[PDB]
XYZ file of C-alpha atoms in Angstrom:
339
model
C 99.317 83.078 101.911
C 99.131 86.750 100.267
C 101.113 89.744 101.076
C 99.330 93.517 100.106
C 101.119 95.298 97.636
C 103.161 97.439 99.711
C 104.774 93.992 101.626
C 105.064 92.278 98.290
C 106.762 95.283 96.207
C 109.451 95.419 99.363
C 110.229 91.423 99.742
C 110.277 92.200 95.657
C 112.780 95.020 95.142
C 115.029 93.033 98.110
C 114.855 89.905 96.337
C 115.262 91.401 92.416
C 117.937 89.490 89.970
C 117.463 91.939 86.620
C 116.148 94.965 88.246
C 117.634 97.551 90.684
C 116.224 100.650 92.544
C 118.686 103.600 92.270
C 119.040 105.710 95.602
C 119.989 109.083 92.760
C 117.290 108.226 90.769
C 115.017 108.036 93.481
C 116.409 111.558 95.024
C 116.109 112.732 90.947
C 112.375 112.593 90.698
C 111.515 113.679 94.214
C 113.364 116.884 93.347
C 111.310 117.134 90.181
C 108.143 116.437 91.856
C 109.006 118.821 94.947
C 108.954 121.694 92.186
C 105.413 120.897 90.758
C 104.051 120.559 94.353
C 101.940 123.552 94.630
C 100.588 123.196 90.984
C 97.340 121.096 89.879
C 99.381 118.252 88.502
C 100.021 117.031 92.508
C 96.228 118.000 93.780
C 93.197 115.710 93.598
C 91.292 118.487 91.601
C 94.342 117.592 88.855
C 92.044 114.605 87.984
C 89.753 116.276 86.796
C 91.116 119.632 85.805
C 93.848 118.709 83.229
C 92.086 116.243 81.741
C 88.694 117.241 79.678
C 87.112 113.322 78.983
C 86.923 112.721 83.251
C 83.703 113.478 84.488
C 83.059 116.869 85.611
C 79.945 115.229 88.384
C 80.627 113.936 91.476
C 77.480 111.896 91.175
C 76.066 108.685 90.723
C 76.714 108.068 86.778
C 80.233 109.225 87.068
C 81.361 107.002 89.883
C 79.496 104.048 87.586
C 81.792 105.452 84.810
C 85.285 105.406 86.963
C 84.078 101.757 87.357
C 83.581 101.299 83.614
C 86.565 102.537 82.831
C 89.333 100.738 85.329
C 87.004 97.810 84.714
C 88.588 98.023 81.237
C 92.214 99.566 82.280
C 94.400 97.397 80.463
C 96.825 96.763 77.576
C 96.506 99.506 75.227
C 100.127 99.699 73.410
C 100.184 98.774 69.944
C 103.679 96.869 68.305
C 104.167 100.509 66.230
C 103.375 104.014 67.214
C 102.193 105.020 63.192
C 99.690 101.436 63.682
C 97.510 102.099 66.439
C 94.069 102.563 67.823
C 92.576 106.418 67.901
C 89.148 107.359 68.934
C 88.030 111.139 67.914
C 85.355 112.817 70.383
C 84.246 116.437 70.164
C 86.255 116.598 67.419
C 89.618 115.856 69.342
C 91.653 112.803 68.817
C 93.018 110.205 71.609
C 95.285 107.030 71.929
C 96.477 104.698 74.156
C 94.036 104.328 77.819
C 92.246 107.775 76.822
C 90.894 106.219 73.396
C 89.148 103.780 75.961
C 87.254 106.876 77.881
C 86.500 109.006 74.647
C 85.161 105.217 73.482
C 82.725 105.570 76.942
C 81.637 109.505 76.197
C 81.042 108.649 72.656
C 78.278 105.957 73.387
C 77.033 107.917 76.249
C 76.751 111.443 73.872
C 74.650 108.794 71.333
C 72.381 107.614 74.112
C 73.943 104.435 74.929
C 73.783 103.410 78.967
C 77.127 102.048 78.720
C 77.938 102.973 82.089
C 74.994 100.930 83.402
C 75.720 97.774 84.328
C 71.489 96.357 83.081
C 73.148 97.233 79.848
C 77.159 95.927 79.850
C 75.730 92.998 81.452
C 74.799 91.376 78.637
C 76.527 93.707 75.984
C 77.588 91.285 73.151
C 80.904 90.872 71.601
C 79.217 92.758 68.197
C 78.356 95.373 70.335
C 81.509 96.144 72.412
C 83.239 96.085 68.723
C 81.193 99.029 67.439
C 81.269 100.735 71.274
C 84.906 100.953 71.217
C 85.609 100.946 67.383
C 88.610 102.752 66.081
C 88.795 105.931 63.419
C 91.984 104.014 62.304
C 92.208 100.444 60.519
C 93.668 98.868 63.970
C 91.559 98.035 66.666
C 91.849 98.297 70.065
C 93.739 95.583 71.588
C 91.867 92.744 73.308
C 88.464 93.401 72.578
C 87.143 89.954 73.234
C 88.444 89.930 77.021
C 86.693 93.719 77.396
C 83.482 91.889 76.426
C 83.985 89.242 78.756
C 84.623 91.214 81.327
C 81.949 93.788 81.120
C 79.305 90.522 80.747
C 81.140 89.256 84.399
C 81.474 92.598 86.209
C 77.467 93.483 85.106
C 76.226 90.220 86.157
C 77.898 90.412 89.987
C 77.258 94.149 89.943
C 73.198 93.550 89.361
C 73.395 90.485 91.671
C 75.304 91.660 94.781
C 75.540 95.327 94.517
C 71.947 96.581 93.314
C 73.424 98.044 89.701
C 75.811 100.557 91.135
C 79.610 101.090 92.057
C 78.458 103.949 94.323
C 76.471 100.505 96.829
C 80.356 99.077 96.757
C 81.779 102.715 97.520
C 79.114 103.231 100.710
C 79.519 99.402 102.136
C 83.510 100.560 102.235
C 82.591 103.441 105.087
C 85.439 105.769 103.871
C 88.142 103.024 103.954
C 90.061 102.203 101.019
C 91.819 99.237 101.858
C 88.129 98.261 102.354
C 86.722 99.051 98.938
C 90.115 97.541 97.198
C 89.714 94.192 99.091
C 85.064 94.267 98.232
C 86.396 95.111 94.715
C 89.188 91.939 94.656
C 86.581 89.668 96.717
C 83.620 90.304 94.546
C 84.858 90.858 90.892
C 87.507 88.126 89.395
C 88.901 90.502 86.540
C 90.367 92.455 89.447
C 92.313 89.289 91.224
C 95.524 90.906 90.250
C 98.149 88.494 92.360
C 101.533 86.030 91.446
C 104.213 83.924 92.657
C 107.556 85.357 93.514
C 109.686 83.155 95.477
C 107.067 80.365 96.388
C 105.081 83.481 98.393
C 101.805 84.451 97.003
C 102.090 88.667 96.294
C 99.477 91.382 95.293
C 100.093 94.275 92.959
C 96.250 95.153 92.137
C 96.830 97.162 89.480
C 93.164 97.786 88.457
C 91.641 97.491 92.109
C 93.967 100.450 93.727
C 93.742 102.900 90.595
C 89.425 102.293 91.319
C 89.525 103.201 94.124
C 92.439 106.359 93.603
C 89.526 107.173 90.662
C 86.739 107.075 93.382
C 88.895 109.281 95.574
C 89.027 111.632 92.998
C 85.550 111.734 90.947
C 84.336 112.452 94.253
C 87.311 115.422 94.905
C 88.296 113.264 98.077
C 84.597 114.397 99.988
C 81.614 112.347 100.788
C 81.117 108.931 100.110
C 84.790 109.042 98.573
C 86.668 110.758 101.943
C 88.939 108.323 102.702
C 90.381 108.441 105.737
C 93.491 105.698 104.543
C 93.609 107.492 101.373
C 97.756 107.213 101.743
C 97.450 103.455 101.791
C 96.922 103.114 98.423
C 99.741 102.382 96.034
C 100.666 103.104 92.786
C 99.175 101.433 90.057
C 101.708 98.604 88.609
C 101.384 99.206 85.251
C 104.037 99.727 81.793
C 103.813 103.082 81.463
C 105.408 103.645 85.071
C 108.354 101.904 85.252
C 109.270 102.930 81.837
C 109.686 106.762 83.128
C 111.309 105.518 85.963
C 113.793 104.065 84.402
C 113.731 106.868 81.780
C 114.002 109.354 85.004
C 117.480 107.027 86.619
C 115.103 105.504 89.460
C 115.333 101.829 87.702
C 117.939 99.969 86.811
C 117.533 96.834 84.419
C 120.203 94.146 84.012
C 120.664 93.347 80.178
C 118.896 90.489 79.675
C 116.178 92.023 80.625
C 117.135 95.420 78.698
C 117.818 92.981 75.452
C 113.896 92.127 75.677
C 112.825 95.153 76.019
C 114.888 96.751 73.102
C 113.621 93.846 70.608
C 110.184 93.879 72.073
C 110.463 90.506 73.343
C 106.671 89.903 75.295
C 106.936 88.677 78.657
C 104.080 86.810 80.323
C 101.781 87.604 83.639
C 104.006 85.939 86.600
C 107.306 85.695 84.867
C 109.813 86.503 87.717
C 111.607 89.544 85.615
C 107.436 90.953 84.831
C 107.043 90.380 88.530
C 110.735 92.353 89.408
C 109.889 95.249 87.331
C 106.261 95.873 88.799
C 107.327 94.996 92.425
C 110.903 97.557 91.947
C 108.337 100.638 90.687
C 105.611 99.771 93.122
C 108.241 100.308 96.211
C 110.429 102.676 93.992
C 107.136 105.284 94.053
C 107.083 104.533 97.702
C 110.702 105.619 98.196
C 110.292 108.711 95.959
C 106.900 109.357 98.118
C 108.997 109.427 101.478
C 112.329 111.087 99.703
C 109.336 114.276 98.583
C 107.904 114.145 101.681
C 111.656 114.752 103.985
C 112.317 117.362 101.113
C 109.343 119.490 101.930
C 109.809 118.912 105.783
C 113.483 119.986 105.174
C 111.893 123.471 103.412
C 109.862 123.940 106.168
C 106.885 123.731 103.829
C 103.394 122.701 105.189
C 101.168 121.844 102.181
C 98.065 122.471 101.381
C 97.326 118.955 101.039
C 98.525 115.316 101.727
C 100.822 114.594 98.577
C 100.463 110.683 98.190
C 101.460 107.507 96.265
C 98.276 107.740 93.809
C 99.244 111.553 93.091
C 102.932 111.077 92.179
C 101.377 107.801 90.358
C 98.701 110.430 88.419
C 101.848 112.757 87.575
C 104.376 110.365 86.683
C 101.784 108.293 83.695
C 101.275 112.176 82.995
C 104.304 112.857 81.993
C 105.349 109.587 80.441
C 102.163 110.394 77.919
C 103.867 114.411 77.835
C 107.429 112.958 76.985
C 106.826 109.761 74.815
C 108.853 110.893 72.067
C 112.355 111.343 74.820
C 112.123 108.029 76.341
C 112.368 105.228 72.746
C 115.740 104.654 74.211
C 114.004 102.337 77.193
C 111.001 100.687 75.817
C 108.166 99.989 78.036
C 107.665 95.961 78.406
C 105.476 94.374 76.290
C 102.453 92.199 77.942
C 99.050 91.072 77.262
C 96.811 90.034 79.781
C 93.754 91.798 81.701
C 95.405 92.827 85.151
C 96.905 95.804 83.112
């Protein structure tokens, strides 16, 4: 049946009617990246260092809050950029996936265990409304699936897994593709696989950016060394291909660039939603390899292993940096819980 996401995004991008990988595009951004490769920005201590709500800890609670937070790591675009969901903490104000994790450090600054799963468990629906309430007048989006999902992912977490996402981390013994395939056996929400072509394919959007989050919470030692660290792709998201295509790496055809520009929503499994994850999941894996001959060419020997979850951690980086320069290729609009 089911191809991994690296097979799928490949027998996608070679199969793709309304989106195309460009070869100078591709070239483009490794050039860019090649640049920023000494700096934090391509680095595991990046995760933590340019952005102040991550954990600080590489303990327990803050590997229970990575898995809080890609638990709930999806669909946070509003229809207008003056309409939208903020959430102040410390007296700064975010949008957009970080209004989710100020949401988290709010509750947990008032006392609230909402990074233990004896609590999210059985959180109700009133409850998850006031965790992640908005300073605005529009809500976050999808509030009644984060409940759901929290009561589903707290129930199997007490049942199988003794309360904590650091159990699931240890039972992987430092292999990722193990903890992404526990995390897609064990917890439904994360069951992020399609149709293209009559062939069942994976992106795991949520499962692979978990574990990329482990990696890093833990600064890529102990219980989150992973020895297959590079398997890991990037995280098929909205934000992504956007700056692709923003960067010349996509291509879209223009039916699928006249749904884009009105806003037209496509739906989970609909072959051009399926095109434009698969084209940027192999399209990072191109750029990855394109970087990689560049610094080889330079004679460079880096002081670490640059991979597809780093260029993944810049790239959503600078689409939040440059949101303003790329309104001229929208991002595609979808709801559902896989991202």
């Amino acid at each position: 049946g089911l191809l991994n996401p690296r097979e799928s995004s490949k027998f996608i991008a070679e199969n793709s009617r309304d989106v195309f990988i460009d070869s100078g595009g591709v070239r483009r951004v490794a050039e860019l990246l090649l640049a920023k490769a000494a700096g934090p920005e391509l680095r595991v201590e990046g995760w933590k260092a340019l952005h102040e709500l991550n954990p600080r800890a590489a303990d327990e609670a803050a590997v229970n809050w990575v898995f809080v937070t890609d638990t709930l790591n999806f669909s946070f675009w509003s229809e207008q950029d003056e309409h939208k969901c903020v959430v102040r903490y410390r007296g700064k104000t975010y949008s957009g996936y970080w209004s989710l994790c100020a949401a988290v450090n709010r509750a947990l600054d008032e006392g609230i265990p909402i990074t233990s799963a004896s609590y999210y468990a059985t959180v109700t629906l009133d409850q998850v409304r006031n965790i992640l309430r908005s300073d605005t007048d529009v809500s976050m989006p999808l509030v009644e699936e984060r409940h759901r999902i929290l009561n589903e992912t707290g129930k199997i977490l007490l049942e199988k897994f003794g309360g904590s996402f650091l159990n699931c981390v240890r039972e992987s013994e430092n292999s990722a593709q193990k903890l992404m395939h526990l995390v897609v056996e064990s917890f439904p929400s994360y069951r992020d696989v399609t149709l293209f072509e009559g062939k069942r394919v994976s992106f795991y959007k949520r499962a692979q950016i978990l574990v990329a989050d482990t990696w890093s919470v833990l600064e890529g030692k102990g219980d989150g060394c992973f020895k297959d660290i590079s398997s890991i792709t990037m995280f098929a998201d909205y934000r992504l291909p956007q700056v692709l295509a923003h960067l010349g790496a996509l291509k879209y055809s223009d039916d699928l660039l006249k749904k884009l520009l009105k806003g037209e929503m496509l739906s989970y499994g609909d072959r051009q939603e399926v095109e434009i994850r698969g084209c940027s999941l192999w399209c990072v894996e191109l750029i990855r390899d394109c970087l990689l001959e560049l610094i080889e060419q330079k004679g460079e020997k880096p002081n670490g292993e640059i991979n597809s979850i780093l260029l993944d951690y810049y790239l959503w980086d600078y689409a939040h940096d440059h949101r303003e320069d790329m309104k001229g290729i929208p991002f595609h609009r979808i709801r559902c819980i896989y991202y």
